[PDB]
């Protein structure tokens, strides 16, 4: 067995299956349990965040630590796609636990509240989804849960969403978030995550914004004065120090030599808008609607939707062999044709993502038009058919391409079968495409994988790219290291409607540290 401080013994066979970093994780989680604090497992996806939770809870139950005689009833909130995945995981890596699913699919086939009571009495592990948490805050928050793990916990990133409040109604201190990216757009998201795990650490939300978000953000802008750069640097370091104990973020560089992943690539392709595509885009930017949006008369979102659609396909207006969703009508589809052609000739499995769902349909009809055997998976595909679809695609190489909407396509699914990944459509959220591309390059990917980001030069999509770069740098400034380089490329204004196509410390260590921080 493996032994830690007070009484934590995790079975040796279980421990040996783990890696060194996963073992560190288990120790970290138990140290938190000792503190009675929560934490964020911010390991980069594919490292296997879930395995660490299995090990830790197993060890805790096995050690029979002393209200509760070991591990009490616990609730797992995870995105709807991965519930049965978690059930499978508990079942293999530790059969003894009862892992009840709370879902329409489920396995209970009675009233749900009976199941809640059953687990809270027999001390099982109730898996559920964020929806059923939002909808039964009353029922669920009446049973003294022992652990409240949220998988892909970033969904609580909005402090005012209903689901966030519901999740923050749970009472136990042993709150855990498993989130490959616990910060996606701005620090308001970070504060929200910390306020679930550790309700006071970062202060109130107003105070956090005032003290951290404003300064840290202002240090990223190109035009920021150096003074403000240094305030940002200070605040970023303070933030890292504040969040260090409670966030365990192992990127895939401190473990790569100790884990042996294959090569990864991140090529970008600046697609060129075709003639019809160019015409529709050039007209719509010149349209009165865009002009009115620039004047602020109505919502900007409408314009952004329209522009993104245009860059994505001329589905504003539809134009034999020129039916809706025709490939040659849009340049990015031409590029996709060439890439899938060469790759199908390479006998290689592709993973094509799209932020949209109806565009996923146009891609689907395209892949009919070709001889490419695919399998499509979006929010409309049934949840019960979800995990078997993933397993099917991973088990056999007959299925060539795998259309995916990024919202269900990301978020914890393992897709090692695919080799090539192409991100067809940008998002305003860097995390979306990041998790999308990271579906392949995980543990068990025994083959090289490259990531292609298809983008329309000079159009809205490049400006969205700039947004998500600026976001990524902001996340880097506070997660990986505060010495980020300032995003000098753009001023990031509302001129994104244009077409510009190519062509004991002994009190001296303390005071020294203080003087360092306050010298900036």
């Amino acid at each position: 067995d493996a032994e830690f401080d007070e009484g934590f013994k995790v079975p040796g066979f279980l421990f040996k299956k783990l890696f060194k970093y996963q073992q560190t994780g288990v120790r970290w989680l138990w140290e938190l349990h000792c503190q009675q604090a929560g934490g964020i497992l911010g390991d980069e996806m594919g490292l296997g965040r879930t395995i660490q939770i299995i090990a830790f809870l197993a060890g805790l139950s096995y050690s029979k630590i002393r209200r509760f005689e070991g591990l009490g009833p616990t609730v797992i909130v995870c995105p709807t796609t991965v519930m049965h995945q978690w059930v499978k995981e508990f079942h293999t890596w530790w059969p003894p636990f009862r892992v009840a699913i709370l879902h329409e699919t489920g396995s209970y086939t009675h009233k749900k509240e009976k199941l809640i009571r059953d687990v809270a009495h027999c001390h099982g592990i109730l898996i559920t989804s964020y929806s059923y948490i939002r909808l039964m805050q009353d029922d669920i928050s009446r049973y003294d849960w022992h652990y409240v793990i949220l998988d892909e916990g970033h969904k609580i990133r909005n402090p005012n969403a209903a689901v966030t409040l519901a999740c923050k109604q749970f009472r136990t201190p042993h709150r855990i978030i498993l989130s490959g990216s616990p910060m996606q757009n701005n620090l308001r998201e970070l504060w929200s995550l910390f306020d679930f795990i550790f309700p006071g650490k970062l202060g109130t939300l107003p105070v956090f914004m005032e003290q951290f978000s404003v300064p840290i953000t202002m240090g990223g802008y190109s035009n920021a004065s150096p003074v403000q750069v240094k305030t940002a640097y200070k605040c970023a370091c303070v933030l890292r120090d504040t969040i260090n104990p409670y966030l365990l973020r192992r990127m895939k560089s401190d473990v790569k030599m100790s884990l042996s992943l294959p090569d990864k690539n991140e090529q970008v392709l600046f697609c060129r808008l075709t003639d019809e595509q160019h015409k529709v885009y050039q007209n719509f930017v010149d349209s009165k609607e865009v002009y009115r949006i620039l004047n602020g008369e109505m919502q900007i979102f409408s314009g952004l939707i329209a522009l993104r659609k245009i860059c994505n396909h001329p589905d504003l207006f539809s134009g034999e062999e020129d039916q809706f969703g025709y490939w040659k009508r849009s340049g990015k589809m031409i590029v996709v044709e060439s890439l899938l052609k060469i790759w199908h000739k390479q006998g290689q499995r592709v993973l094509l993502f799209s932020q949209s769902r109806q565009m996923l349909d146009i891609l689907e009809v395209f892949l009919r038009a070709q001889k490419y055997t695919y399998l499509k998976m979006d929010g409309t595909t049934t949840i019960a058919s979800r995990q078997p679809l993933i397993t099917r695609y991973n088990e056999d190489t007959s299925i060539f391409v795998f259309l995916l909407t990024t919202r269900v396509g990301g978020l914890g699914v393992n897709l090692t079968g695919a080799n090539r990944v192409v991100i067809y459509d940008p998002d305003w959220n860097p995390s979306t495409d990041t998790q999308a591309r990271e579906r392949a390059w995980r543990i068990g990917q025994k083959k090289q994988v490259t990531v292609y980001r298809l983008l329309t030069a000079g159009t809205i999509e490049e400006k969205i790219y700039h947004r998500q770069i600026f976001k990524q740098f902001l996340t880097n400034r506070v997660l990986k290291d505060p010495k980020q380089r300032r995003f000098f490329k753009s001023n990031d204004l509302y001129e994104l409607f244009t077409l510009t196509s190519p062509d004991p410390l002994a009190s001296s260590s303390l005071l020294a540290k203080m003087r360092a921080r306050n010298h900036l």
Binding site: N160, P206, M209, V214
Partner: protein, 51 residues
């Protein structure tokens, strides 16, 4: 207290364009700034912005 529709009738012009009363436009401004203040107190905003 926002009055009923009788106190601020939306008179229809010759066509279909429904013109709203002055009270309705003012209540629109009030609800706009009230929602704006509600979100600014709920989410990130400076003290001077809320002021």
């Amino acid at each position: 207290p926002v009055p009923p529709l009788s106190v601020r009738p939306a008179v229809v012009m010759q066509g279909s364009a429904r013109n709203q009363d002055d009270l309705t436009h003012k209540l629109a401004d009030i609800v706009k700034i009230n929602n704006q203040l509600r979100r600014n107190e709920q989410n990130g905003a400076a003290a001077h912005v809320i002021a």
